[PDB]
Design a protein around this nucleic acid. Structure first.
Ligand code: SAH
Lengths: 121, 32, 144, 125, 127, 202, 58, 72, 189
RNA sequence: UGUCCUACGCCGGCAGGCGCGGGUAACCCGUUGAACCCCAUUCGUGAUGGGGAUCGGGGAUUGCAAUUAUUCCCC
C-alpha cells in the first residue's frame, strides 16, 4: 500500500500540520478549521480501545454517531460502528479508506425496488 | 415629453453648452 | 487640422497599433501568453497567437477614449456572456490577471501612467504616439 | 448665432448644437460615417442625401447622444440633425427656405421632425 | 492547394484511429483523454501551425506531438492543466490518454467498491 | 393544429411529409406502441400466424410490427410517396395503392383481423364536393365487414377532433354489420388517450 | 376555467352518444373508477387491470 | 445519402476548376462546394486563391457571405 | 434620385397585374434608401398596404423564434439576395420581386365549413391584400425550408426562390403551394 | 438596492486571498463600459468545432457541520 507515494509507517510519523498537503481541498479546509471536542473525544476513545487490545486479533467495537468524522491515518485498524439514523454499522478501518468520511460507510437509506383489458363481447 | 426623458435631455443640453463654453496650484500664500 | 483617433476606423486602428507594438518589440510578454483563456466564459484559446499585442492596443485605445480606468474596468469591458450549461446564460467579467499584465506592460513602455484619482491613464508620449499612428492609418485609408 | 435642439426615440436622447461652419458634422466627436452600425448608415445620411451637400456647406453641428440602443440612437441622431437645420433656417435664414425644407422632410419621413410616441408598457398587479 | 503525395487518411496514434481529413487541433481531440483545449496547447507547444491539416503531417511532427502528449510537464505545460493531478496511490501530475484512462477509471471504481463506500455501492447497484 | 384539417390526405402526405414522417422519432415509438395494443386488443388466435389487413399502413410501421410477430398482412394507402418509402423499408407484407372509402377489393371472408392505425379520422371530412363523409365511412365499413372473415375483430385506432367525428364513425359501423364497442385505454390520461374501435364481424 | 371546459366537453361527448342511441335503435336495431381525487391523472388499481374505458356499440 | 466532399484538391478537380470556375456568372463558396464536391473551407481558400491571380472579381464581402463574378 | 441601397433604381419598376397595383408600394413616393423604417404600420387597417414591399419582405424574414427581432440580419440577407439576383439574371431585383409576388399569390382559395360532422370546403376568391400577404409568406417559407441544413446560404436560397417564382417555374415552393391551393379550390367549386 | 454594495493597488491562469479608500446614498459602485446586435477569423451537412447530461481527479469559498456530491473554478 501507498497513499500519494507515502507509506503507512511514515504516515503515522507524519505531522499534523503538513498532513494537510496530501489531503484534498475540503479535507485541508476542515483540518484548518480544526477538530472539535467530540472528534478529539472519539480520537481518545479509539486510542484507548486500541490500547488494551490483545496483540493477536482486532480490538473491540467503538460505536458513534460521528458521521462527519474523517478517517485519520492513526485510526487504521480500528473497529468502528457508526450510526445511520436507525442502526449501527460496523466497519474495518482500511489504509485506503483515508480520504473518506465515516458517514459514507453506513448508508442511511435503502435502495428502491419497485394485465391488459381485452373485450370478449 | 414627460419628467425623466426631459430631465436627461436638460442635463445633456447643459453639459453640451458647458463643454462648448470650455473650448494650477491653489493660492496657498495670500499675498502677491 | 491634425486627424484625431476619433476620426479613424477603430478596428483598423487596433490592427495597425498592434502591428506597431509588435514591431517595437519592447512589450513584456508573459510566459503564460500561450496557456491561458482570456476569461472564464471562454471555451478555447484565441487562434491569433499574438493576442497580447492586440489586447494591449485595445487597452491603449480604451484608455485614450475614457481614462481613469483600472483593472476592474478592463474586466468589465472585455466581459461577455457565459453559457451556463442547461442553465440561463449570464454576464461574466474578464480575467483580472490579463488586464493587470497588459496595464503593467503598457506602463513599462512609458506609454501609460498612473494618476492620483484612480487607476491608469495615458502619457503625453501615449497621446502623440496614438495621434501619429492614427495619422498613418488615415493616410492609408482616406487618401486611397 | 447658434441654436440647440433635441431629438429622441424610446429612451435614446440626442442634443444637437448648430453653429456657422464649413460642413463638419459630428456625433460624440465622431463623423457620421463612423457611428457603429453601417447597416443603418443611410439612416444617418438621409437629410444629407435629400437636402444636398450645398445646404450643409455652411454649417457645423455637434450632437451629444445618450441612452437607448444602437437603432434608437441613430434615429435620435437623424431627428436632432433635421430639427437643428430647421431651427437654423427658421431663426437666421429666410422663412420660405425653411418651408420647402420642412415640407420635403415631412413627405419623405414624417418622424424627422416629430418624436415617435411609443415606449415600453408597464406591468400591473 | 492540392493533395500531397504523402497524405495519410487514417493515422494510428495510441491505438486510436485518427481521421486525417480533419484539422490537427481536433484530430488530436479525437483521441480519448484529449479535449479541444489540451490539443490546442500541445500543438502550440510543438510549434505547429493550426491552419494546417492533420493527414499530411510528417512522421517527425507526429512523434514530437506524441512525446509532448505523454510528457506534458517537461514542455512547460502547467501543473493545473492535467487530468489526474494528485493520484491517490502515487501522487504525481500525470495525463493518461488511451488505455490508462479506462484502466484508471476501472481501479477507481474498484477501490470505491472494495471499501464499501456509498458511491461505489450505489454505482454498482446502478447496473 | 391537426394534420387532418390541412386537406386531401394524398396532397397533405407528399414526398416532403413522407421524409419528415420516418425522420420523426415520436412517430416510430407511438405507432409501434399503438400497433402493439391494437394486436393485443383484437383477440387473434393465440400461437397462430394470422392474416391481417393494414387499412392505413403509411410507412409500414404497424406493418413491420406484424411482420416481426409472424402475421402476414396486406397494406392499403392513398399516399403514393408513403407507399414508396414503405417498400424502400422492405416490409414483408404486400401493398396496394387504394382508397378505404372507395372499398377494399378482397373476397368476403379472407382476412382474419384488420389493423387500422390513425387513418379513419380522414374519412369524416369531405375534401372534395363529390366526397360525402357519411357515405364514404359507411361504404368502407360495409366492405371491411364482408372482406373480414365473419367473426374476426378489426381494431380501429382513431384520433377524433370532436364527438361528431366519433358519432359518424360509430353509426356507419354499427349499421354496416360491425358489432363490439370502443376501448379508450387510459381515458383520463391525455397523452395516452387511445381510442380503439374494436369491431368484430360476428 | 379550463377544468369546466374539459369536464363539460366530456359531458357533451356523453350526451351526443346518448342522443345517437335512439335513432340508432330506430333506423337500425368510462374511467369513473379510475379517476383520482387528489390529482388529475390515472391511477392503477390492484383488483382491476390497467385503466381503460368500455363503451359498447349497439 | 452522406456527403463525401473532398478536403484537398485532386488533380482532375483542380484542373477542371481552374478551367471552369472563372465563368459561372455566380461564384460563391456554397455553389462551388455543391457542384465540385468540395468542403467549404477548401472552396473558400481556392476562391481567394483565384482572386489573388486577378481572374475573379469581388463585388461584395461579408463575414457571412462573400460573392464574386467573372471579369468579362 | 432616391435609390435603394445607394444603387437600385425604382423608376423602371412596373406592375403587370391591375389587382396588385395599389397594394405593392414601390414607386417614387415609396422609394426608400433602406428597408428599415420602424413605422406604425399596423395600428390601423389597410395601413400596411402602403409599406414598401422590400420592408414587408424584411419583416417577414424575422421568423421562427431565434430570428425574432433581428432586423439588421434580415436587411443584410435582403441586400445580399438582391446582389445575387442581379448578378444572376442581369436585371433589376425589384422587378424580379414584383413578378415573384404576382406569380406567387393565390387567386382562389378554400374555406372550411361545417354544421355537424359534415366538414366541407367552399371555394372563395382572395382579396389583393391577402394575395400579397400569402405571396410574401410563401416566398419566405420557401427560402427558409429550402436551405436550413446545407451549404447554401439563406441569401442564395432566397435569391433562387424569387428568381424561380418570377419565372413561374414549378421548382419553387411558393408556386407549388399556390398550384395545390388553386387545384383544391377548383375541385371545391 | 446597498453597512453590506464596492472603487483602487498587489499575487494567482481561474475560482479566489492580502491591504487601503468611498457610500445611511440622484454625492460611492455608476458617464450602471450588460447581452442580443455590428465587424473580422475558423469551422462545412458530418449525432460533427451543434448539444450538453452523467461521470474521474485536483483547487477555492460560506458555514459548528458539505458524506447522499451546498456552491464556484480547471482538465
Ligand atoms: N381514404 C384513404 N384511403 C387510403 N389510405 C388513406 C385514406 N385516408 C388516409 N389514408 C392514409 O392514412 C395514413 C395516415 S398515417 C398511417 C400510417 C401509420 N400511422 C403507421 O405509420 O403505421 C396515410 O399514409 C394515408 O395514405
Amino acid at each position: 500500500f501507498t497513499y500519494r507515494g507515502v507509506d503507512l509507517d511514515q504516515l503515522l510519523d507524519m505531522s499534523y500540520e503538513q498532513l494537510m498537503q496530501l489531503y484534498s481541498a475540503r479535507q485541508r479546509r476542515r483540518l484548518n478549521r480544526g477538530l472539535r471536542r467530540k472528534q478529539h473525544s472519539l480520537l481518545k476513545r479509539l486510542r484507548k480501545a486500541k490500547k488494551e487490545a490483545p496483540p493477536m486479533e482486532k480490538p473491540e467495537v467503538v460505536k458513534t454517531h460521528l458521521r462527519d468524522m474523517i478517517i485519520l491515518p492513526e485510526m487504521v485498524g480500528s473497529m468502528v460502528g457508526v450510526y445511520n439514523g436507525k442502526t449501527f454499522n460496523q466497519v474495518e478501518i482500511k489504509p485506503e479508506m483515508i480520504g473518506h468520511y465515516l458517514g459514507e460507510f453506513s448508508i442511511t437509506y435503502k435502495p428502491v425496488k419497485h394485465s391488459r383489458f381485452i373485450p370478449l363481447k | 415629453v414627460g419628467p425623466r426623458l426631459s430631465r436627461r435631455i436638460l442635463q445633456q443640453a447643459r453639459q453640451q453648452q458647458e463643454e462648448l463654453e470650455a473650448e494650477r496650484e491653489r493660492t496657498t500664500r495670500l499675498g502677491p | 487640422p491634425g486627424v484625431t483617433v476619433k476620426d479613424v476606423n477603430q478596428q483598423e486602428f487596433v490592427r495597425a497599433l498592434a502591428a506597431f507594438l509588435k514591431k517595437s518589440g519592447k512589450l513584456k510578454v508573459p510566459e503564460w501568453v500561450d496557456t491561458v483563456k482570456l476569461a472564464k466564459h471562454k471555451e478555447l484559446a484565441p487562434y491569433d497567437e499574438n493576442w497580447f499585442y492586440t489586447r494591449a492596443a485595445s487597452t491603449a485605445r480604451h484608455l485614450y477614449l475614457r481614462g481613469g480606468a483600472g483593472v476592474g474596468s478592463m474586466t468589465k469591458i472585455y466581459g461577455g456572456r457565459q453559457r451556463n450549461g442547461v442553465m440561463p446564460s449570464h454576464f461574466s467579467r474578464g480575467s483580472k490577471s490579463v488586464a493587470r499584465r497588459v496595464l503593467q506592460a503598457l506602463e513599462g513602455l512609458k506609454m501609460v501612467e498612473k494618476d492620483q484619482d484612480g487607476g491608469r491613464k495615458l502619457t503625453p508620449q501615449g497621446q502623440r504616439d496614438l495621434d501619429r499612428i492614427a495619422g498613418q492609418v488615415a493616410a492609408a485609408n482616406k487618401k486611397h | 448665432q447658434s441654436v440647440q435642439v433635441f431629438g429622441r426615440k424610446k429612451t435614446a436622447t440626442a442634443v444637437a448644437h448648430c453653429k456657422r461652419g464649413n460642413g463638419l458634422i459630428k456625433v460624440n466627436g465622431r463623423p457620421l460615417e463612423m457611428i457603429e452600425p453601417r447597416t443603418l448608415q443611410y439612416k444617418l445620411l438621409e437629410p444629407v442625401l435629400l437636402l444636398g451637400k450645398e445646404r450643409f456647406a455652411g454649417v457645423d453641428i455637434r450632437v451629444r447622444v445618450k441612452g437607448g440602443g444602437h437603432v434608437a440612437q441613430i434615429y435620435a441622431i437623424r431627428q436632432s440633425i433635421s430639427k437643428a437645420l430647421v431651427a437654423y433656417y427658421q431663426k437666421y435664414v429666410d422663412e420660405a427656405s425653411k418651408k420647402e425644407i420642412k415640407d420635403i422632410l415631412i413627405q419623405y419621413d414624417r418622424t424627422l421632425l416629430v418624436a415617435d410616441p411609443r415606449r415600453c408598457e408597464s406591468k400591473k398587479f | 492547394l492540392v493533395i500531397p503525395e504523402k497524405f495519410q487518411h487514417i493515422l494510428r496514434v495510441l491505438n486510436t484511429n485518427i481521421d486525417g481529413r480533419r484539422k490537427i487541433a481536433f484530430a488530436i481531440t479525437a483521441i480519448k483523454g484529449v479535449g479541444r483545449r489540451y490539443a490546442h496547447v500541445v500543438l502550440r507547444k510543438a510549434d505547429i501551425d493550426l491552419t494546417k491539416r492533420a493527414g499530411e503531417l510528417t512522421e517527425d511532427e507526429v512523434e514530437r506531438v506524441i512525446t509532448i502528449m505523454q510528457n506534458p510537464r517537461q514542455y512547460k505545460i502547467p501543473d493545473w492543466f492535467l487530468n489526474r493531478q494528485k493520484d491517490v496511490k502515487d501522487g504525481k501530475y500525470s495525463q493518461v490518454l488511451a488505455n490508462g484512462l479506462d484502466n484508471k477509471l476501472r481501479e477507481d471504481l474498484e477501490r470505491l467498491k472494495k471499501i464499501r463506500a456509498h458511491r461505489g455501492l450505489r454505482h454498482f447497484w446502478g447496473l | 393544429r391537426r394534420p387532418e384539417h390541412g386537406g386531401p390526405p394524398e396532397l397533405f402526405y407528399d414526398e416532403t411529409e413522407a421524409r419528415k414522417y420516418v425522420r420523426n422519432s415520436r412517430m416510430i415509438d407511438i405507432q409501434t406502441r399503438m400497433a402493439g395494443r391494437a394486436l393485443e386488443l383484437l383477440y387473434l388466435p393465440e400461437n397462430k400466424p394470422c392474416y391481417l389487413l393494414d387499412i392505413g399502413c403509411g410507412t409500414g410501421l404497424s406493418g413491420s410490427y406484424l411482420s416481426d410477430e409472424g402475421h402476414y398482412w396486406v397494406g392499403l394507402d392513398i399516399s403514393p410517396a408513403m407507399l414508396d418509402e414503405a417498400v424502400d423499408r422492405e416490409i414483408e407484407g404486400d401493398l396496394l395503392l387504394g382508397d378505404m372509402g372507395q372499398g377494399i377489393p378482397f373476397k368476403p371472408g379472407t382476412f382474419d383481423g384488420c389493423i387500422s392505425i390513425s387513418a379513419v379520422q380522414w374519412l369524416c371530412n369531405a375534401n372534395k364536393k363529390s366526397e360525402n363523409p357519411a357515405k364514404r365511412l359507411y361504404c368502407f365499413f360495409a366492405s371491411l365487414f364482408s372482406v373480414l372473415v365473419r367473426g374476426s375483430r378489426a381494431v380501429l385506432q382513431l384520433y377524433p377532433e370532436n364527438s361528431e367525428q366519433l358519432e359518424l364513425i360509430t353509426t356507419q359501423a354499427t349499421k354496416a354489420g360491425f358489432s363490439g364497442g370502443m376501448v379508450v385505454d387510459y381515458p383520463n390520461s391525455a397523452k395516452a388517450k387511445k381510442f380503439y374501435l374494436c369491431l368484430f364481424s360476428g | 376555467r379550463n377544468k369546466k371546459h374539459q369536464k363539460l366537453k366530456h359531458q357533451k361527448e356523453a350526451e351526443e352518444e346518448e342522443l345517437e342511441i335512439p335513432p340508432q335503435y330506430q333506423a337500425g336495431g368510462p374511467g369513473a373508477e379510475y379517476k383520482a381525487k387528489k390529482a388529475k391523472g390515472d391511477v392503477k388499481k390492484k383488483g382491476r387491470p390497467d385503466p381503460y374505458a368500455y363503451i359498447p356499440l349497439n | 445519402d452522406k456527403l463525401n466532399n473532398l478536403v484537398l484538391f485532386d488533380k482532375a478537380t483542380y484542373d477542371k476548376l481552374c478551367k471552369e470556375v472563372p465563368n459561372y456568372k455566380l461564384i460563391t463558396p456554397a455553389v462551388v462546394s455543391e457542384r465540385l464536391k468540395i468542403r467549404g473551407s477548401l472552396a473558400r481558400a481556392a476562391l481567394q486563391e483565384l482572386l489573388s491571380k486577378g481572374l475573379i472579381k469581388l463585388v461584395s464581402k461579408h463575414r457571412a457571405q462573400v460573392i464574386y463574378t467573372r471579369n468579362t | 434620385d432616391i435609390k435603394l441601397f445607394g444603387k437600385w433604381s425604382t423608376d423602371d419598376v412596373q406592375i403587370n397585374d391591375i389587382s396588385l397595383q395599389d397594394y405593392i408600394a414601390v414607386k417614387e413616393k415609396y422609394a426608400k434608401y433602406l428597408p428599415h423604417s420602424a413605422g406604425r404600420y399596423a395600428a390601423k387597417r389597410f395601413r400596411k398596404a402602403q409599406c414598401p414591399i422590400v420592408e414587408r419582405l424584411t419583416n417577414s424574414m424575422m421568423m421562427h423564434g431565434r430570428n425574432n427581432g433581428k432586423k439588421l440580419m434580415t436587411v443584410r440577407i435582403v441586400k445580399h439576395a438582391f446582389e445575387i439576383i442581379h448578378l444572376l439574371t442581369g436585371e433589376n431585383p425589384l422587378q424580379v420581386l414584383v413578378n415573384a409576388i404576382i406569380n406567387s399569390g393565390p387567386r382562389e382559395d378554400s374555406t372550411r365549413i361545417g354544421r355537424a360532422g359534415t366538414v366541407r370546403r367552399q371555394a372563395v376568391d382572395v382579396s389583393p391584400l391577402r394575395r400579397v400577404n400569402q405571396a410574401i409568406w410563401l416566398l419566405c417559407t420557401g427560402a427558409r425550408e429550402a436551405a436550413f441544413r446545407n451549404i447554401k446560404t439563406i441569401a442564395e436560397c432566397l435569391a433562387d426562390e424569387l428568381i424561380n417564382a418570377a419565372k413561374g417555374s414549378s421548382n419553387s415552393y411558393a408556386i407549388k403551394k399556390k398550384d395545390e391551393l388553386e387545384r383544391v379550390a377548383k375541385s371545391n367549386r
